[PDB]
Amino acid sequence: MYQLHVRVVEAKELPKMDTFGKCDAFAILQLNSSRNIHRTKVIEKTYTPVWNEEFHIPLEDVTIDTLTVFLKDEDKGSSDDPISLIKIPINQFPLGEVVDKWYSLIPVKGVKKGGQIRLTIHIAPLGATPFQKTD
Questions:
Q1: Angstrom distance (rounded) from CA 73 to CA 126
Q2: Residue 135 lies in a domain
Q3: SS3 content of the chain, % helix, strand, coil (to 5)
Q4: From the record, what ranges are coiled-coil (predicted)?
């Protein structure tokens, strides 16, 4: 069996949500359409949030599983306000490798830019140290 270790590192080039503030961003991770849904903290008033948060998500089938990453602005009267999202196929990560890179979030309709998000992703067997190359 395999575990998905995802470090939601940081994002940049976020849009200004509304005329007062910059952005109060957090990310949501979801495996497939399952109840494995995780949320980062909110970083207030910045276009360059750094979360550096690790999540450990059991995988069902590395050949077909998908990770959706949603970037949203904290609720200010209208529920969490969507910014952008990306759907990442798990089968593109070589097993055991710690893959650190940037992803281009697709802005939702009405949002002026989607931001870019840095994720460090490691698919490993149970018992392997998360975020270290699995020999």
A1: 34
A2: no
A3: 0, 50, 50
A4: none
